[PDB]
Structures are given as C-alpha cells and as structure tokens.
C-alpha cells in the first residue's frame, strides 16, 4: 500500500464526468471539477485541466496524470501550511497517508475545524484522536471511508485497506 493505492480505493476510477458524494461534478480518481451546478462549467474546467476538448470524457492515462497532480498538490499544501506541517512531520509514513487522504477529500479549509484532532495526533494519543475525528460532518456523511482513514490513524497499519 501507498497513498496512490489508498486513494484509488477510496475514490474509484470513472472516465466520464460524474457527481461526487456532495453532488459536485468530478472525473477520474476523484478530481473535483467545479461546485457550480452547470455541466458546461464542469466541461470547461475539464478541458482546461487536460489541455484538449474532451466533451466530458478522458482516458485512463489522463485520469492517472490528474490524480498524480492532485496528490502532489495535497502534499505541498500540507507542507506550506503552518498548522498542518508540524503535525504531518511528526507522523510515520502510514499515518502521513491518512493525512494526505483527508486533505485530498476536504482541502485545507475543510480540515480547519480539526484543531483538537490535530493536537491529539501530534501528541500520539491515537485512540483519543480516533474518537475525536469521528465527531465530524466528515464521518457522518462518508462513514465507511472515514472509518478506514481513522483506523489508519489509530493503528498506523494498512489493515482497513487489506
Ligand atoms: C486535519 C486532519 O485531521 O487531517 C489532515 C492532516 C492531518 C495531520 C497532518 C496534516 C494534515
Ligand atoms: Cl463512505
């Protein structure tokens, strides 16, 4: 297991524009296109991202390319964030994957309310952090995925993805 395999499991792979769990236009391995209700707006974002006129459909190679860019962007966003970087650098590699997973799903703003969870993770109070992480809109709206990520933080193993 690695972050790419983990997120590929959590996000799936679809080569035509679809709606994510929140109803937003998405493609590939969970690449958000837009929060606008306009399919044309989503198609424009797609063409801009791929560099050609796609009319809502991409290849597997293109999906994987976008996915690599998106994972890298999540990592670099963590490393540029004064709140997240110290916590990230305190973690082992398996738990760093759980961290990237959350940023990929919710972005830096989506994790802003997790200050207490972040402190517990930095303190390595894993069971306490797991309890706190579940007290969230995130867990309630995507509980199976959140449970996998939380188990990864709790145990430091890949057991939830095996
Ligand atoms: C904020 C959160 O709970 O997950 C994202 C994260 C976690 C630890 C370090 C960096 C980002
Ligand atoms: Cl879920």
Q: Is 121 in the pocket of ligand 1 (CB under 6 A)?
A: yes
Q: What secondary structure does DSSP assign to 81-135, as a single string? A: -TTHHHHHHHS-HHHHHHHHHHHHHHHHHHTGGGHHHHHHHHTT-HHHHHHHHTS
Nearest CA among 108, 57, 113, 102 for reference residue 78 = 108
The domain spans of the chain are: 6-161
Q: Which helix (H) or strand (E) holds 19?
A: strand 14-19
Number of CB atoms found within 10 A of residue 113's CB: 12
Is the domain spanning 6-161 CATH 3.30.450.20? The answer is no
Residue whose CB lies within 8 A of the most ligand 1 atoms, among 88, 91, 120, 145, for a mutation test: 88
Backbone phi, then psi, for 121, in 5-degree steps? -65, -45
Contacts by 18-25 with C-beta closer than 8 Å and gap 24+? 21/141, 21/142, 22/141
Per the listing, tokens 């110290």 go with: 86
Q: Tell which residue, 8, 10, 22, has the closest CA to residue 60.
A: 8
Q: Which of 110, 92, 109 is nearest to 146 (CA)?
A: 110
Question: Rounded CA gap, 26 and 157, in Å?
Answer: 30
Which ligand has the minimum distance to the alpha carbon of residue 90?
A: 1
Cβ of 153 below 6 Å from ligand 1: no
CA distance 99 to 93: 10
């Amino acid at each position: 297991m690695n972050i790419f395999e983990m997120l590929r499991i959590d996000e799936g792979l679809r080569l035509k524009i679809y709606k994510d769990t929140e109803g937003y236009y998405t493609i590939g391995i969970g690449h958000l296109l837009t929060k606008s209700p306009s399919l044309n707006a989503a198609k424009s974002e797609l063409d801009k991202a791929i560099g050609r006129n796609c009319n809502g459909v991409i290849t597997k190679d293109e999906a994987e390319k976008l996915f690599n860019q998106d994972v890298d962007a999540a990592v670099r966003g963590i490393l540029r964030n004064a709140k997240l970087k110290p916590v990230y650098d305190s973690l082992d590699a398996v738990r760093r994957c759980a961290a990237i997973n959350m940023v990929f799903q919710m972005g830096e703003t989506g994790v802003a309310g997790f200050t207490n969870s972040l402190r517990m993770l930095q303190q390595k109070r894993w069971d306490e952090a797991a309890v706190n992480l579940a007290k969230s809109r995130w867990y309630n709206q995507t509980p199976n995925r959140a449970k996998r990520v939380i188990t990864t933080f709790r145990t430091g193993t890949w057991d939830a993805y095996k």
